[PDB]
């Protein structure tokens, strides 16, 4: 890696590891990965994600919990973390509680999992919330994979997953996440 | 080979209005630890009912049941034996049916009750 | 409720012939649709996924479609083995509700 600029000076480089940055810290930071170009992971304290983009809408207003107030969240789970880590993200991607539409969460009197379910689609009525979070996913994830295509139907699902051990630590969308996360 | 096969614990699944009866459901070739599993009923000319699903340590091995058997009905696990069972209490000449233990998995990245692999069948039948 | 309606309960076809069962949900239930084969009152098959989705290890003879309350199961080049009975379900609230079913006959 290193050069000679002239015979006396030299360049050089130094390079961080992650591996020592989130390891030898005892505060529970928030993890965003992007493993590939269909799955996105976040981790907070004891909850952990998998985000998604497709065309299947895994929940529906009619029979799923409508979540238009933070404190709405608590039908969603049982885990104080993940109820937390949803809230945080959803504010992190700039969703304002006031003015956007709801999103939809399942009862957690059910039995199928926890997840929750936003809109996301570029078309029509939404265009306009569909840019702004896709502007937020660009925040909170380096190189963000965006698989939402323009007129098309996608919704975005997160749910529980074990968190990736081959996952890319990457320490800027911690920093991203940390930063837009304040309200 | 993913095995689901149903039997009768005590006596046959002949029994007359009043009495009790236990379903159970041995499985083998998965995990069966990691997978959700349901009751359903299927009586003569009629369709089929969904009976009651119970979920994985994880969520606390929670149970969800269908309205007309809260309170009579009543389904576990054993996740050592690999086996789901089904209580029934207080039976009716109404509950009179071929009944299912079913397993359900994940489907295009999502978890969904629809069922991938059932067990054989176990008629049951109530009358005086 | 949701009533999963299969107005069609017989249905004659001939080996080779093209058949489509319908089902249609009282309510609106997006994709949340399986369809399910079953022989001689034993153990159902599962077929269909996510209303559109194949099952593994069914043969591509099944597809189907449909979203909101209008699903369709459709069986191109209709072997003998495929004769059965045919029903839907809906997975988007409890309780689970399934299809009162259709009989695939021999057309004589």
């Known amino acids: 890696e290193a050069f000679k600029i002239g015979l006396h000076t030299e360049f050089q480089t130094v390079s961080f590891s992650m591996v020592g940055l989130f390891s030898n810290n005892p505060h529970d930071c928030p993890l965003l990965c992007t493993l590939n170009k269909s799955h996105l992971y976040i981790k907070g304290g004891n909850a952990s994600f998998q985000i998604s983009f497709d065309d299947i809408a895994v929940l529906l207003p009619q029979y799923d919990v409508i979540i238009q107030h933070p404190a709405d969240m608590s039908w969603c789970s049982k885990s104080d973390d993940q109820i937390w880590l949803s809230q945080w993200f959803m504010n992190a991607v700039g969703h304002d509680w006031h003015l956007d539409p709801p999103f939809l969460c399942r009862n957690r009197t059910k039995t199928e999992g926890f997840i929750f379910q936003v809109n996301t689609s570029k078309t029509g009525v939404n265009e306009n919330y569909a840019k702004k979070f896709k502007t937020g996913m660009h925040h909170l994830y380096r190189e963000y994979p965006d698989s939402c295509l323009n007129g098309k139907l996608c919704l975005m699902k997160a749910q529980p997953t074990s968190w990736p051990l081959q996952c890319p630590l990457d320490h800027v969308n911690t920093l991203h996440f940390l930063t837009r996360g304040k309200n | 080979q993913i095995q689901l096969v149903q039997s009768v614990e005590t006596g046959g699944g002949l029994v007359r209005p009043g009495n009790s009866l236990k379903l159970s459901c041995v499985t083998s070739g998965f995990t069966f630890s990691n997978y959700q599993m349901h009751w359903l009923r299927q009586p003569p000319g009629k369709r089929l009912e969904w009976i009651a699903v119970i979920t994985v340590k994880s969520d606390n091995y929670g149970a969800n049941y269908v309205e007309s058997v809260k309170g009579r009905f009543a389904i576990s696990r054993d996740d050592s034996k690999s086996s789901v069972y089904l209580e029934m209490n207080r039976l009716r000449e109404e509950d009179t049916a071929t009944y299912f233990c079913s397993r359900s998995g994940i489907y295009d990245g999502y978890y969904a009750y629809a069922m991938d692999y059932w067990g054989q069948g176990t008629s049951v039948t109530v009358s005086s | 409720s949701v009533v999963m309606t299969q107005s069609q309960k017989f249905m004659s076809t001939s080996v080779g012939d093209r058949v489509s069962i319908t089902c249609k949900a009282s309510?609106?239930?997006?994709?949340?649709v399986a369809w399910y084969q079953q022989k001689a009152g034993q153990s159902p098959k599962l077929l269909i996924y996510w209303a559109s989705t194949r099952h593994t290890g069914v043969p591509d003879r099944f597809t189907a479609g449909g979203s909101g309350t209008d699903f369709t199961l459709t069986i191109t080049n209709v072997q003998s083995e495929d004769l059965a009975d045919y029903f839907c379900?809906?997975?988007?609230?409890?309780?689970?509700?399934f299809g009162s079913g259709t009989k695939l006959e021999l057309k004589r």
């Open positions: 309510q609106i239930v997006g994709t949340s």
């Open positions: 379900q809906q997975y988007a609230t409890y309780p689970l509700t």
